[PDB]
Symmetry: T
Subunit: 150 residues, 12 copies
C-alpha cells in the first residue's frame, strides 16, 4: 500500500521535527530552571534530552529505510514541528516540568497515531519502534504527573 508508507513517512518526518525541537527545548529548561530541586531536575532533563535525541535518530533512520530522506535542518524542523520553542529563560522547576509533561503528552498522542497506521498497514518494524518510544514516554509522563501532583 503506497498510500500507507507515504502516510507513515509524513508522520515520521513530523516526529523528527518535534523531537529535534524538544531536544533544544529540554536544554533550555536544563539550563534555566532554578529552585531547591535544581540538581535533580537538571539531571533529569539531561536524561530526557538524551532519550529524546535517541528517538530522534532511530525514527529518522527508520524514515531513511522506508526510502524517504529525513528533515535535517532547524529551518525544516521549525516548519514541520507542532511544538512551540521556549522563549523565556529563568523558569521555575514545576513550571518547566509541567511544560515537558505537556510536550511529552503531545508527542504521545502523535506517536500513537503513527503506531495505529503502522499496525493497520503491517509495518511491524515501524510499529515496534514507535511502541518502544511510546513506552518510555508513558513512564516519563506518569512520573512527571506524580512529581507535579499536589
Amino acid at each position: 500500500d503506497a498510500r500507507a508508507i507515504a502516510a507513515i513517512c509524513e508522520q515520521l518526518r513530523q516526529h523528527v521535527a518535534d523531537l529535534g525541537v524538544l531536544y533544544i527545548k529540554l536544554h533550555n529548561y536544563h539550563w534555566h530552571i532554578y529552585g531547591i530541586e535544581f540538581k535533580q531536575v537538571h539531571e533529569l532533563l539531561e536524561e530526557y534530552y538524551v532519550s529524546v535525541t535517541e528517538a530522534f535518530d532511530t525514527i529518522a533512520e527508520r524514515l531513511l529505510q522506508l526510502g524517504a530522506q529525513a528533515p535535517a535542518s532547524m529551518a525544516e524542523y521549525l516548519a514541520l514541528s507542532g511544538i512551540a520553542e521556549e522563549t523565556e529563560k529563568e523558569i521555575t522547576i514545576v513550571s518547566a516540568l509541567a511544560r515537558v509533561k505537556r510536550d511529552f503528552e503531545y508527542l504521545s498522542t502523535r506517536f500513537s497515531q503513527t503506531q495505529v497506521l503502522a499496525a493497520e498497514s503491517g509495518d511491524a518494524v515501524t510499529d515496534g519502534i514507535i511502541t518502544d518510544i511510546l513506552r518510555t514516554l508513558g513512564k516519563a509522563i506518569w512520573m512527571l504527573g506524580a512529581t507535579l501532583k499536589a
Copy 2:
C-alpha cells in the same frame, strides 16, 4: 575579567552555542544522507562528531550561565545568531560531506580562537581552558579530515 570583557566574551559564547547547535543537526544530515563504499565508517565518524559537538554545546552554554548570562535556547535564536549555513540538500557524497564539515570545523576554530584570545587577555582562565580544550579536539579532527580528503 572586567565587566566589558565579560560582555564581549558572553557575546562570543552565545554565538558558539548557536553555531554548535546548527552544526549538531547539520552533522546528522550528513550522518543520514551520505552514501558510498566508506558509508559505515563515515556514518560512525559523523556520530562521534555530533556527540563531541553537543558536548561542547553544553559546556559552553553552561559557562555562559556561570558568567551571569542566559544561553540562547531555541532554534529560532540559533538560526538568528549562527554563522553556519544549514545543509539543505540530502543525498550527498562522502568526500563532499567531509569537506563541508572540515570547512565548518575550521570556521569554528577561527571563531573559538578569537574567544580564547579575549579570555586570555582578560584573565578569564576558566573560559580560556574551556575553549582551548575544544580547540584541541577541533584541531585534531581538522587535521584528520584533511588527511582523508588529501588527493
Copy 3:
C-alpha cells in the same frame, strides 16, 4: 475507548496479585527443595523470583500510568490471586519445578488474554509490556518442560 482501559486495568490488577503470590511461592521452593540438584535449582528459583518481581513492578507501574492504583498489600493479593500458595515445606525438586511450570502456564494464558485485549484496543504499550513477559515465560515453560520430561 475507556471501556477497554477498564478491562485491561482489571487484568493488570490480577497480574500484580498473581505475580506477588508467585514471588513468595518461589521463595518457598527456593528454601525447601532438596535433592542432588539442589544448588542449581535453588539458583534457578532465585532467577525466577527476580524475574517475577521485575514483571510485578513493570505491570504495577503500567497500571499506574493507565490512571489506576495498584493493589499493594498481601490481603488484596490473596483476594485477587488465582494462584494457590504453597502450604507445604520440604518438597522434591521435580515436584517443585512441576508446580512452577504449572503456575507459569497459568500466568501465560492469563497474560495472553490481556495482550489480546491491549492489541484489539490499540494499547500498544501494554501490549509490548505483556508480550515481553510472555516471551520470558515461554522460554521458562519450555525449559522446565525439557528438564521434567521423562
Copy 4:
C-alpha cells in the same frame, strides 16, 4: 547454651524470632512497593528510588534470615497467609499518599524492626549463636543508618 551448641530453649526462641522477622520483612517488602507506587510530590523521583533501594535491601534481609532459619533446622514461613498471621506490621491500605507521610511510616516500621531485631541479637549473643548474631547485627546496622537518614529528612 555452650560454645558451639545453643540449648534447645535458646535455638527455639531464636527460631521463633527469626520466623517473625521473615514475616515482618515480607509484609514490609510489599508495603514499600505501595509507597513506591503511590507517593506524589515534588520529591517523587528521589523518594521513588529510595523506596526501591529499601525494598531491595528488605528482601535481601528477608532471604538471609529465612536461610539462617533453615540452617538452624527449622522451616521458613513461606506464604502470605502465614506472614499476615505472624507479622506485627500493619499493611498499607490507602493509595495516594504524601511523601513525608510515607517516609514517616517506613521510619516507624524500621524502628519497630530495629527493636525486634535487637531482641534477637541479644538472644543470639547470650546463647553463643555467633552466626545469627552477626547476621542480625549487619541488618541492624543498615536499619540504623536508614532510620537516622529518614529522621534527618523528616526533621522540621
Copy 5:
C-alpha cells in the same frame, strides 16, 4: 485457523532456521574470501553479521521448540529446506560480496514478514515480537548495505 495457524508458523520457522543456518556459513565464506582495500572493515562487518545471524538462528529455533515442534538440526535438512543458495566461489570482490548479502537479507526480510503477518493475525504475540525484532535489525543492515553500495 488455530492448530492450522501454529502449524503454518512452525513451517515458516523451520525454513527460517534453515536459511539462517545456510547464511551463517555463507557469511563466513565472504568473511574469508573477500579482498580489497576495505578488507578489514568488511571482514569485521561480516563477522558482526554472522554473529547476529546465528543469534536469530538460535532464538527462532527455540521458539519452534516452545511451539511444540522440533527444530531442523543438520546441514542435510538445511540444504533441503533453505531457499538460500550457498556461495560456491572463493576469492570475491567486496562490492560483490556485500551486494549478495544485501540480497539474502532482503530475501530473509520478505520471508520473515510473512511469518510476522501470520503470527500477528493468529495472536501469536511472542513469535510476532521475535520476528519483528529480527526484522528491525535486518532493515537497518539492508539500509546500510544499500548506502555503502550506492553509486
Copy 6:
C-alpha cells in the same frame, strides 16, 4: 620448504574445518533436543562447546588461508569432506547426547593429533601451536565428559 608437507597439512586443515562445521550444528541439535533433570546445565555446556568449536572452526580456516589455500565454505563441501555423521534424531537423553559428543571430540582429537605431528615434523610451528591449543581444550572436555558419564 617441502611443498608436499604444506599440501598434506592443508588437506588435513580442510577436513578439520568441515568436521568442526558439522559438529557445530550437531551440538545445536543436542543443545535443543536433550531432556532430563540436568537439562539447563547440559544445555549451557553444549553452548560453551559449540562456541568453542566455532572458534576453532574460524582459526583453522584462517590458518588455511594463510597457507595460501582457500577454505571450504559451504555445507555441501562440509558434508562431502566431514568424517562426522550428522545427528538425525531429535529428542535425546542427556547421557546419550554427551556420550556422542565425547565420541566426536575423541575422533577430532586423533585427527588433530595427526596434523600436529605433520606440522611438527615439517617445521610448521604456527599450525603446530594452533592445533595443539585446540588439542588442549579437547583433552580437557573429553576428560570432563568421561568423568560425568562414568558409572
Copy 7:
C-alpha cells in the same frame, strides 16, 4: 592484657590453619576424582570451596601473626596438628565426596565456634569477627550440602 586467653586463642588458630591446609588439599582430591552425571557442577563447587578455604586459611594465619605468634607453615606441622584425616582414596562417588566435606565442614564449625567463644569472652573482638565471618560461610555451605544430600 590476658596472655592466658591470647595463648589459648593462638593455640586454636594454629590448629585452624592446619585443618584448613589439610582440607584445602582434600578438596582438590574430590575436585579431581569425583565422577558422576553431576560432575561439572560439583567439580566447580569443590573449587569454590577450596578457594574459600584457602581464604580463611590465610586470614586466620595472619590473625595469628598479629597476635604475636608465628603460623604453622609446612605440611609436616599441619599433619601433626590437624584433626582432619586426609583422603587416601581416589575415584569417589559424588554423594560420598559431598558427605565427607559436609562432615569436615561441620567439624571445623564446632572447632571454630569454640574459638569464637574464647575470643568473645576475652574481648578479642577482631578474632571474634574473623571467626564469625568464616562461621557464617560454613553454616551456609553446610546447609546447602545437607539439602543436596537429603533423600
Copy 8:
C-alpha cells in the same frame, strides 16, 4: 620575577592548602548536621564536594612540594593560615548550609584567581593549569548552588 614570583605563589598555595583543609572538615559538618526533606541529595552532594576539595587539597600541596617548599600539614597551621571560618553550629538548615558553602566556594574562587594571575604573569604554566582546573570545578559548583538557592 623568578625567585620572587615563586615565593609569592608558594605563599598563596600554602594558604589554599590551609583553606581547603578547613573547608574539608566544614563540609563534613554540613554533611552530618543538615536536615530537611532534601537531606539525602544534599548529604551526598556535600560528600562529592569534600571529596573534590580534598583532591584539590592534595594536588596543590604537592605542587607546593614541587616548587621546593614544604606544605603546611597540621590543623594548628591551617587554623593559623586559613581565611575560612569553621562552622561552630550543629543542626543546620539545608538552604543555610548551601548558602555558606557557596560563600566559601566564592571566597576560594577569588583567592585562586589571584594565584592563577600570578602564575600566568610569571610563566608558571603548571601552577596556572592546576589552579585553573580547580577554578573550573568551583565555577560550576558556584553556579549550581546559585541556581538551587535562587528564589
Copy 9:
C-alpha cells in the same frame, strides 16, 4: 535500655572522630614529607591509610549522629579532644614516619577496644560491629608496619 552507657559510648566516639581527624592530616604530612628510596611505595601506602582513616572518620561520626548526639566538626574541637599529637616537622625519614603511624595506630587500637568493650557490655551491637571492623583493619596495618620496621 541504659542511657548511661550510650553517653559513655558517645563520649568515646566523639574522641575517635577527633583523633581520626587529626591522624588524617598527620598522614598527609608524612605522605608529603617522607624521603628515601622507598618513597613511592610508602607515599602510596600513606594515602591508602588516610583514605581508610577518613572512612572510619565518617562512619564513626555518623554512628554518633544515629545515637542522638552531634559530631565534633571543626579543627578547633578536634585539637581540644584529640589525644594524638600533630606532626610539627616536615622532611622525615621513612622508618621514622612509619614508626610514628604504627604508634598512633596502636594508640587508636587500645582506644577503640575500650569502646568495643563498652558497646559489647551494653548491648550496642551496631557500634560494636562498627568499631570491631575498624579494629580489624588497624590490626592488619599494625602487624604489617611492625613487619616492615622489624630489624
Copy 10:
C-alpha cells in the same frame, strides 16, 4: 607408547607434589618475612603461590586426562616431593627470595625434563602445558636474580 606416557605421568605426579609443597612454603615466607620491603615482597609471594597453585591444578588435571590419578594428600606430597619444607619462621627478605629462586630453578630443571619427554613422545598437549609454566618460571627466576644481585 605406553611407556612414554608412564614416564610422563611419573614426572607429573612429582610436579604436583613439588608444587603442593612450594605452595605452602611460599605462604611461610609470605607470613614470616620482615624488612623494609615487606609489603612488596609479601604481595609478590602471594602472586607466586597463586601462580603455583594454578600450575598445581593444571598439571594434576593433565595427569587425570592421561588416565592416571593425581596425588592428593600431604602425606603423598611429602613422600614424592624433592622440595624441602621451610622449618624456620622469621626470615630475612633476601634470604626468603634466594630460597624461592632456588626452588623455582629446581622446578625449572625438573619441568624441562618433562617437556623433553613430552616433545620426543609426541605428547603435544603436555608439552605446551609444561612449556607455559616454564615460561612463567623463567621470568620469575630472572626477576628474582635481578633483585638479589649485588
Copy 11:
C-alpha cells in the same frame, strides 16, 4: 650444542629486538604520514601494529635477559643490528604504506622462523613458544594485509 645453541639464539634475539625497535618507529611514520580516504581505519590499524610490535619487542628482549645476555638498548645499536630500512619519506599513499609493512612483516617472519627452528632443535621450549606466538600474530597480519592489497 648446548651452550653454542644458546649463543646462536641470543644473537638472533638481539637482532629481533633491533628490527622490532626500528619497525616500531617506522610504523609511527606511516601512522602519521599516510593519507587517503581510508585514513582513519589504517591510522588505527598501524597503531594496533606498533602496539603489538612493541609488545614483541619487550617479551623478546626479556627472554634475552633470561638467557643471561643483555639486550641492545639504544637506537645506535638498533641501527647497527637491524636489517630493516627506516622510512625516510613523509607523505605516503595508504597502499604503499601497507605494502611496505607487509614486506617488513614477511622479513620478520622468515627471521623469526629461523630462531624458532634453532630453539626447537636445541630444546629451548620457552624461546620456541615465545617466537611461535609472535609468528602466529605475524601470519594473521600478513594474510590480512595481503587480502586488503590484493587487486
Copy 12:
C-alpha cells in the same frame, strides 16, 4: 599572523619528538638492566614512564602534523636532533638509573617550558595546553624521583 612563531614552535616540537623517542628506548634500557632489592618496583615505574613518554611522543608529533609540518620519524633523524644521550651501558644500579632519568626529565622540562613560553606569547593556545599537560606530569615525576633519591 606570525608564520615565524609557528616555525619556531615546530622546530621545538620536532626536537621534543626526537628527545622523547630517544628517552623511550633509554627507559627500556634501565627497565631491563637495573638490579637491586627494589628491582620489581623500579622495573614497573620505568615502564609507567616509557608508556607516559611514548604518549607525549605521539601527541606532540600529531600537534606538529596539525601545524602543517611533518614529524621526524626515524631513529636516524632522532639521533641527529636529540639532545639526550643514549645509555651505552647495561647492568646499572637503581639509584644510578633513577638519577639519570631525573636528569633527562629535568632537561625535557626546561626544553618544554621554552616551547610553552613561545606558544603562550604567540597565542598558540592548543600547543600551550599540550606542552603544559606534559610539563605537569614531568613536574610530578621529577619531584617523586627527587624524593626517592634524597639522602
